[PDB]
Amino acid sequence: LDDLVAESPRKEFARINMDGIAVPDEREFDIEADMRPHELEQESDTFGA
Amino acid sequence: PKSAPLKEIPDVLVDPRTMKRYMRGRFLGKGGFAKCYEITDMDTKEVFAGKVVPKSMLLKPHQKEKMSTEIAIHKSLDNPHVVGFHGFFEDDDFVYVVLEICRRRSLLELHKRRKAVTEPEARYFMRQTIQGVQYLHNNRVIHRNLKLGNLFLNDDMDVKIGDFGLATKICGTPNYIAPEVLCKKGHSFEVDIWSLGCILYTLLVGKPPFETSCLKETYIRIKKNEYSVPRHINPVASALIRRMLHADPTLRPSVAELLTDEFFTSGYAPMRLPTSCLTVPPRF
């Protein structure tokens, strides 16, 4: 299990609510999200061609 | 050995009679000895399901007889709840059949994912299927192989009855066989009614009413009319199933009185379903 860098919360050991979390500006969310692991499967615009 | 090497299917299917060109796309599956492909009409870009049947498998007059009957019957059909026939043609090696595509597959696949569906969903699928069967019987066609697997679904989740391989207008082995066929009392439209009975049971219970591990016990259960509707099914549906599955074809309902049974006139009956229903229960 050491390969696991991240996983879903185990309800038993997880925080019980998200009251502790501050909601950011969308801009900061977007910037930080770019530096997070993600896949957006961008398929590029062919501009009608 | 005892078979010729299979001929390869052209990349473009041409109907010389109408000069139409269908680009053969992806494999959709193989049903019996036919293979089906997504085909695209290269002038209009309409997409269809192309059933490709090798002539090598049509050699005896009985097999050609069969194919030609399936085709004559099916082309004579035009109904929102029957798979649309859009034409047929042939080269030296194949008979190509152009069908309305049903991209959401079949009620069998739905059965495998969902098992027992909710009663409203059952209402919806059975109503649509029955309107289909009504049309067929009004045109003197007995389908004779109604099953989950030939109740097709389109992208709007409308049901299309297909696979007219055993159909006749007034055989091989049907999925759900009626007792009268087995007893060899000959048979009539009531046969279709029996199958709908088996389909309704299956949609509500989550498993087939008769079929078991061994084929011969299935047969016995069918002759003896031996099946049981589980207690958690409600009475109204249970009574409908019993009527549909009656040992005596003369005592099963007409297709015409199916939609007026209390199972259809009571209870929530959604008129449309979302595609989400293909995999999990709906909102309700």
Binding site: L1, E7, L40 | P274, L278
Partner: protein, 213 residues
């Protein structure tokens, strides 16, 4: 049950050694009738703060929050399903929600916004949701509530999607081509080395899913 049945199906195909055959006929194991209804098209691992956000193939979206609740938005951008800690599922709209869901709704929209590039019947849309996931350096694994397990391989941008209900495995290659195979047919006709090793890998991933809970 989903994972258990999946594990057993994978053990069986893998134990038949489908690539170790003189002549592989992979194409005979194809079963397009078993094509998945939904898969995960996009995802964002923001689990250091909020949770994991994702988009399904029908453009609905979801987030698994770090408190083990889930909020799902349909394609219409309005209808939501919410799954609380005790797995109770509630239906609501984004116009009308409990004030306790207020932060989650905002977070959800953000994910949705970041990932983006109504006939009769649509109102009955209910979606499967993300039950568990884990990520390693080379792959992510995603388990939905309908039993589907999806494995994205990061190196070659490929995917496997496994369903224990259809007994099927879909491979999505670099060129984004979907191929769906019946695993009992893979057992009979064989598959290539590359697929076979991905099936072994999948059995390993699925074991890791069962071991976290």
């Amino acid at each position: 049950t989903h994972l258990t049945d999946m594990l057993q199906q994978l053990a069986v195909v893998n134990a038949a050694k489908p690539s170790d055959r003189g002549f592989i006929r992979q194409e005979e194991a194809e079963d397009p009738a078993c094509i998945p209804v939904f898969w995960i098209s996009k995802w964002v691992d923001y689990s250091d703060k909020y949770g994991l956000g994702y988009q399904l193939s029908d453009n609905s979206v979801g987030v698994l929050f770090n408190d083990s609740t889930r909020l799902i938005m349909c394609a219409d951008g309005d209808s939501l399903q919410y799954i609380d800690r005790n797995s109770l599922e509630s239906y609501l709209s984004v116009r009308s929600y409990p004030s306790a869901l207020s932060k989650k709704i905002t977070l959800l929209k953000y994910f949705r916004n970041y990932m983006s590039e109504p006939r009769e019947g649509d109102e009955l849309t209910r979606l499967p949701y993300l039950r568990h996931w884990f990520r390693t350096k080379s792959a992510i694994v995603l388990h939905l509530s309908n039993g589907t397990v999806q494995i994205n391989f990061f190196q070659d941008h490929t995917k496997l999607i496994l369903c224990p209900l259809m007994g099927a495995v879909t491979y999505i290659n670099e060129k984004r081509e979907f191929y769906t195979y019946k695993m009992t047919l893979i057992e009979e006709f064989g598959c290539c080395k590359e697929l076979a090793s991905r099936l072994r890998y999948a059995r390993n991933m699925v074991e890791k899913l069962m071991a976290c809970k």
